[PDB]
């Protein structure tokens, strides 16, 4: 079985 | 102004979303020039470097972000994703658990943690963490789709109809918005998506490879246009992560050494290190050249190596599976690149020219399912090494404990020699099957099984309990060596009834859907006493199958599960079934070859996807067209006739037992010859100045 994908988080600058 | 660096960072985030990764990197870096201690920009930059395959540089910038901002949960979670990709699972876990400690409401970190549990075999915890992620962030396609696959894995079909609707809706929205679909290409075959969507999923995943090779700024390769530099020999390169103990080697490990060295020069490029098994030894010894690219992690340097070897046809044996380095194909070091055997579907990618298949698996009217041109093998594209790996199953004998061919079975390389010593064996016409009566020797064998003994010795011959192979010879259990002893296999070993029909399926449970179990229930209801023999993969799916079956009118005692067994025991115990019921949603591929090699007829209903049509291709090559159903009614009727007309069952089992030898299905020498003829059609076509076109002969 292949590696399960993940979710990168984009940080908004405020 | 602080607005300056913030504006650059936030614009870069937009460019990342749009797929403009190079511009995003440019903007993140300008932000860091304006504002050097900008934690958000360090972490966002690291995220796009990760997407470009620059993993160490990404780690450096994550650590910088966290040095600046020790409670920066985004950076911990993103860094975990990079460590997971580097195979540092413990490091990933420590990062995710720190991010969730900082921010318990961090939906992305919960979902990324869940992906570790999923890959570790802890499906209950993965489900719990994905459900926390969706509670926190209800619009979350990665979490929803990976949860859906967790539920597929354990055969949890709660609200399955609504689940498929949302999966399709998610994919449709992501494709429309030019985003990477959250369904993986190798899973898309399991869900009711259009062929267009499945090919588009594949194409979008292949595009990830482009982001990773573009940073290498390599020019196009110059490709050979003749065979002069190779003395008239066509140079074929097989690229695989699976030269070792993996089913793909169990299928084709004989093929490199069977190539004709007068016309072909064979290069095997391993993407994995040497696992020490006989599978790896054999290909390393039998290929003309063996190259360990696991020592060359840069795809630019690895592709240079392939090109320097002068490869004419490069064969992709991974597609979208673990261990793939499709970046090597995206760089196009060879003039012709073909998909073959390891991945049941299209790459969807421009850098693959052909998929090697056959007219049964991929009839020309469905060519639009594939981005590649079709290249037909003459019978089936599937192949298996069973004749070389398991020659001890070429013959069998039984004990007449009362005559059945699959209640108490003996196999052995020296089985004939053993039977010569026993003057009271009877030969039954159905090749021929010897029957040992219920004598002193048979009682000792039965006693070994019932007492759980490991092996006994009779007349100098070692007689082994089939459940104990790893204690006798671990290399025989894995298929690395042919067993030396006479092995005993019985229905009692697996809790199967001695007076009823056994229908088996030994596939992963995620290949079963409600529609399939309903069809199996219909069959069992029409064959009194029959049982269904399934695999614990995983065990936590057993009570779900049982509940749905009982809900369909099947008592629990009609379904019998067994654990995953070593390779040799798995193939050998197929002899105990009467009939194999193939999964229509995604057929058994390796396991279809396995049951046929045991002589067990397999009933199948080919679908539309490649993965749903392989078993019928195998049965066509074998010569058993009567096992191929055109619809669900036919599938049920075939299975019920096999289970109720015992003379017909005897006839069909005899066909499989004989044609597994006489048909082309397991004939690796013929396969290699036919494969070579196909390579030469590809080459002559190219050498004549043509772009790839269908090779359907
Ligand atoms: C897709 O198959 C990959 C992929 C990567 C690694 C291993 C395999 C498999 N190798 S194999 O196909 O030859 C093989 C072996 C023993 C087996 N023993 C049995 O009792 C039943 C099946 C079986 C199959 C594999 O061993 N497993 C079991 C595991 O991972 O524990 C995965 C499975 C595939 C079908 C059913 S279960």
Crossing angle, helix B123-136 and helix B141-153, to 10 degrees?
150
What is the C-alpha to C-alpha distance for residues B148 and B163, in angstroms, rounded to an integer? 7
Burial of B447 (0-12, 13-18, 19+ CB in 10 A): exposed
What is the separation, in whole angstroms, between the first and last Cα of chain A?
Answer: 41
Of the candidates B186, B205, B307, B312, the residue annotated as catalytic is: B186
Residue B172 is encoded by which pair of tokens? 């449709």
Contact between chains at A5 and B17 (C-beta distance less than 8 A)? no
* Six token digits for residue B52: 């470009």
Closest CA to B171 of B157, B187, B158: B187
Residue B379, Cα to own-chain centre: how many angstroms?
A: 21
Nearest to B107 by CA among B81, B140, B78: B140
Q: Chain centroid to CA B19: how far? A: 30
Give dist(CA B513, CA B508) in Å, integer: 11
Concerning whether B186 is annotated as a catalytic residue, the answer is: yes
Place of tokens 């006479």: B486
If one counts every other C-beta atom within 10 angstroms of the C-beta of residue B652, the result is 22
Q: How far is the CA of A1 from the centre of ligand 1 (A)?
A: 10
Residue labelled with tokens 């950076």: B75
Q: Which residues on B lie below 8 Å from A11 (Cβ)?
A: 9, 13, 40, 43-44, 74-75
List beta partners, residue B292.
B270
Provide the angle, in degrees to the nearest 10, between the axes of the packed helices B590-597 and B646-662: 110
CB atoms within 10 A of CB B378: 16
Per CB-CB distance under 8 Å, the chain A contacts of B142 are 5-7
Nearest residue by C-alpha to atom 27 in ligand 1: B564
CB contact under 8 A, B142 and A10: no
Residues on chain B touching A5 (C-beta within 8 angstroms): 115, 142, 146, 182, 184
**Distance in angstroms (rounded) separating the CA atoms of residues B660 and B458:** 31
Q: Using CA atoms, how far apart are residues B602 and B652, in angstroms rounded to an integer?
A: 10
Distance in angstroms (rounded) separating the CA atoms of residues A12 and B41? 9
SS3 label, residue A5:
coil
Q: Are residues B337 and B236 in contact, defined by beta-carbon separation less than 8 angstroms?
A: no
Residues of A in contact with B130 (CB under 8 A): none
B276: left (phi over 0), alpha (psi -120 to 50) or beta: left
User: How many angstroms separate the CA atoms of B404 and B263, rounded?
Assistant: 49
CA distance B399 to B393: 16
Nearest CA residue ID for atom 33, ligand 1:
B508
DSSP conformation letters of B355-392: EEE-TTTS-GGGGGG-SSEEEE-SS-S----HHHH-GG
CA angle B559, B564, B565 (to 5 degrees): 120
- How is residue B77 written in tokens? 């979670």
What is the radius of gyration, based on Cα positions, of chain B? 28
**Alpha-carbon torsion (B197, B200, B202, B208), positive or negative:** negative
Residues of A in contact with B182 (CB under 8 A): 5
Is the Cβ atom of B253 under 6 angstroms away from ligand 1?
Answer: no
First-residue to last-residue Cα distance in chain B: 69
- Compute the distance from residue B121 Cα to the ligand 1 centre, in Å: 14
Q: Which pair of structure tokens corresponds to residue B630?
A: 């055109």
Residue in chain B lying closest to A14 (CA)? B6
Ligand 1: which residue has its CA nearest to atom 4?
Answer: A1
Answer yes or no: are the C-beta atoms of B436 and B425 closer than 8 Å: yes
B248 lines ligand 1 (CB under 6 A): no
- Token pair listed for B495: 């809790």
- Cβ B567 under 6 angstroms from ligand 1: yes
C-beta B343 within 6 A of ligand 1? no
**Alpha-carbon gap: B74 to the closest alpha carbon of chain A (Å):** 6
Q: Tell me which residues of chain B, numbers 310 to 349, contact chain A at a CB-CB cutoff of 8 Å.
A: 320-322
**Using a 6 Å cutoff on CB, does residue B507 contact ligand 1?**
yes
Q: What is the C-alpha separation between B697 and B693, in angstroms, rounded? A: 11
Judging by DSSP bridges, how do beta strands B397-399 and B408-411 pair with one another?
antiparallel
Q: Which CATH architecture has domain B502-670?
A: 3-Layer(aba) Sandwich (3.40)
Looking at the complex, report in whole angstroms how far the Cα of residue A5 sits from the nearest Cα belonging to chain B: 7
Rounded Cα–Cα distance for residues B307 and B455 (Å): 53
Q: Do A9 and B41 touch (CB under 8 A)?
A: no
DSSP, res B569: H
Out of B567, B572, B594, B600, mutate this one to test ligand 1's pocket (max ligand atoms within 8 Å of CB): namely B567
**Residue B583 backbone dihedrals phi, psi, to 5 degrees:** -85, 115
What residues pair up with B354 in beta bridges, in sequence order?
Answer: B338, B373
CATH T-level fold of B228-385+671-688: Rossmann fold (3.40.50)
Q: Three-state DSSP class for B469?
A: helix
The helix or strand, by DSSP H or E, that contains position B639, with its residue range, turns out to be: helix B632-644
Which candidate in B84, B241, B507 is best for mutational testing of the A interface (most A CBs within 10 A)? Answer: B84
Adjacency order of strands within the sheet including B336-339: B289-292, B264-270, B234-240, B313-316, B336-339, B354-357, B373-376
Q: Please choose, from the candidates B115, B328, B201, B283, the residue with its C-alpha nearest in 3D space to the C-alpha of residue A1.
A: B115
Pick the CATH number of B386-494 from 3.30.720.150, 3.40.190.290, 3.40.47.10, 3.30.750.24: 3.30.720.150
3-state secondary structure of B218: coil
Q: CA B573 to CA B563: how far, in whole Å? A: 12
Interface with chain A: mutation pick from B8, B10, B14, B65, highest number of A CBs within 10 Å:
B10
Strand partners, B266: B236
Strands B264-270 and B234-240: parallel
Residue identifier of the C-alpha nearest atom 9 of ligand 1:
B247
* Three-point CA angle B654, B657, B660, nearest 5°: 135
Token couple for B264: 């072909």
Q: How far is CA B686 from CA B116, B150, B221, B569, B680, in A?
A: 45, 45, 16, 46, 10
SS3 B87: coil
Closest residue to atom 14 of ligand 1, CA basis: B567
Is the CA virtual torsion B86, B91, B93, B97 positive or negative? negative
Q: What is the largest CA-CA distance in chain B?
A: 100
The two domains B228-385+671-688 and B386-494 share their CATH topology (first three levels equal): no
Q: Which residues of B634-648 are buried (b: 16+ CB within 10 A; e: fewer)?
A: ebbebbbbbbeeeee
Q: Looking at chain A, which residue has its C-alpha nearest residue B142? A: A7
Q: Tell me the two tokens of residue B32.
A: 């860091």
Beta strand B455-458 with B461-465 is antiparallel
Number of CB atoms found within 10 A of residue B130's CB: 28
Angstrom distance (rounded) from CA B359 to CA B378? 8
Q: For B530-563, what is the HEC assignment? A: CEEEEECCCHHHHHHHHHHHHHCCCCHHHEEEEC
3-state secondary structure of B579: strand
Using a 6 Å cutoff on CB, does residue B570 contact ligand 1?
Answer: yes
Radius of gyration (C-alpha) of chain A in whole angstroms:
13
Question: What secondary structure does DSSP assign to B201-212, as a single string?
Answer: HHHHHHHHHHHH
Residue B277's CB is within 10 A of a number of other CB atoms, namely: 17
Indicate if ligand 1 lies below 6 Å from the C-beta of B508. Answer: yes
CB atoms within 10 A of CB B486: 23
Counting Cβ atoms within 10 Å, is residue B689 exposed (0-12), middle (13-18) or buried (19+)? exposed
Report yes or no: B492 and B498 within 8 Å, Cβ to Cβ. yes
- Cβ atoms < 10 Å from Cβ of B474: 12
Angle at B106 between CA B100 and CA B110, to 5 degrees: 65
* DSSP H or E segment with residue B480: none
Helices B73-85 and B89-102: angle between axes, nearest 10 degrees: 170
Residue showing tokens 């190259």: B291
């Amino acid at each position: 079985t292949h590696e399960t994908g993940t979710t990168n988080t984009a940080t908004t600058a405020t | 102004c602080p607005t300056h660096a913030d504006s650059l960072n936030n614009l870069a985030n937009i460019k990342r979303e749009q797929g403009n990764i190079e511009e995003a990197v440019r903007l993140y870096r300008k932000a860091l020039e304006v504002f050097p201690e900008f934690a958000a920009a360090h972490s966002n930059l690291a995220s796009v470097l990760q997407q470009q395959g620059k993993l160490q540089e990404a780690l450096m910038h994550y650590k910088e972000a966290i040095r600046i901002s020790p409670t920066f949960a985004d950076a911990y979670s993103n860094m975990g994703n990079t460590l997971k990709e580097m195979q540092d699972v413990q490091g990933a876990l420590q990062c995710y658990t720190r991010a969730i400690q900082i921010n318990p409401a961090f939906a992305d970190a919960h979902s990324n943690l869940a992906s570790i549990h999923k890959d570790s075999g802890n499906i209950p915890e993965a489900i719990a963490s994905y459900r926390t992620a969706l509670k926190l962030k209800p619009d979350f396609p990665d979490a929803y789709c990976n949860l859906a696959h967790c539920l597929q894995i354990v055969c949890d079909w709660t609200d399955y109809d609504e689940r498929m609707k949302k999966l399709v809706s998610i994919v449709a929205d992501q494709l429309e918005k030019n985003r990477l679909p959250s369904v993986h290409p190798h899973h898309s075959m399991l869900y009711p998506l259009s062929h267009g969507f499945r090919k588009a999923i594949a194409e979008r995943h292949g595009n990830l490879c482009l982001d990773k090779i573009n940073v290498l700024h390599k020019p196009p390769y110059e490709h050979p246009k003749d065979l002069k530099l190779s003395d008239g020999r066509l140079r074929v390169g097989y690229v695989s992560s699976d030269f070792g103990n993996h089913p793909t080697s169990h299928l084709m490990q004989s093929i490199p050494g069977m190539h004709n060295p007068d016309k072909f020069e064979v290069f095997c490029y391993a993407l994995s290190p040497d696992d020490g098994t006989n599978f790896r030894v054999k290909v390393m010894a039998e290929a003309n050249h063996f190259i360990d690219l696991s020592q060359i992690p840069c795809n630019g340097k690895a592709a240079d190596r392939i090109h320097q070897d002068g490869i004419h046809i490069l064969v992709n044996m991974n597609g979208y599976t673990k261990g793939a380095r499709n970046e090597l194909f995206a760089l196009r070091p060879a003039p012709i690149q073909a998909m073959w055997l390891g991945y049941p579907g299209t790459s969807g990618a421009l850098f693959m020219d052909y998929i090697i298949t056959d007219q049964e698996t991929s009839p020309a009217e469905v060519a639009e399912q594939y981005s590649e041109k079709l290249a037909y093998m003459p019978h089936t594209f599937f192949i298996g090494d069973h004749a070389n790996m398991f020659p001890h199953l070429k013959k069998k004998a039984v004990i007449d404990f009362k005559i059945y061919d699959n209640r108490i079975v003996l196999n052995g390389i020296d089985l004939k020699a053993f039977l010569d010593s026993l003057p009271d064996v009877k030969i039954v016409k159905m090749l021929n099957m010897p029957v040992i009566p219920m004598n002193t020797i048979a009682e000792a064998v039965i006693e070994m099984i019932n007492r759980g003994q490991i092996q006994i010795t009779i007349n100098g011959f070692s007689i082994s309990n089939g459940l104990a192979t790893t204690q006798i010879n671990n290399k025989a259990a894995t298929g690395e060596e042919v067993p030396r002893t006479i092995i005993v296999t019985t229905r009692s070993q697996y809790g199967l009834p001695e007076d009823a029909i056994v229908y088996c399926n030994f596939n992963q449970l995620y290949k079963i859907d409600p529609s399939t179990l309903q069809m199996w229930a219909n069959i069992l209801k029409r064959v009194p006493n029959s049982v269904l023999w399934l695999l614990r993969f995983p065990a936590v799916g057993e009570p779900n199958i049982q509940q749905y079956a009982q809900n369909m009118g099947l008592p629990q005692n009609r379904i019998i599960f067994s654990p995953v067994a070593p390779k040799e025991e798995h193939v050998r115990r197929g002899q105990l079934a009467d009939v194999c019921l193939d999964t229509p949603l995604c057929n058994g591929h390796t396991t279809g070859m396995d049951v046929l090699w045991a002589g067990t007829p397999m009933v199948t209903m080919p679908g539309e996807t490649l993965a749903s049509r392989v078993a019928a291709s195998q049965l066509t090559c074998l010569g058993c067209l009567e096992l191929i159903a055109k619809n669900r009614q036919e599938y049920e009727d075939i299975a019920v006739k096999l289970g109720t007309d015992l003379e017909y069952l005897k006839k069909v089992r005899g066909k499989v037992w004989k044609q597994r030898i006489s048909s082309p299905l397991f004939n690796t020498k013929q396969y290699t010859m036919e494969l070579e003829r196909l390579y030469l059609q590809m080459w002559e076509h190219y050498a004549a100045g043509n772009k790839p076109d269908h090779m359907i002969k």
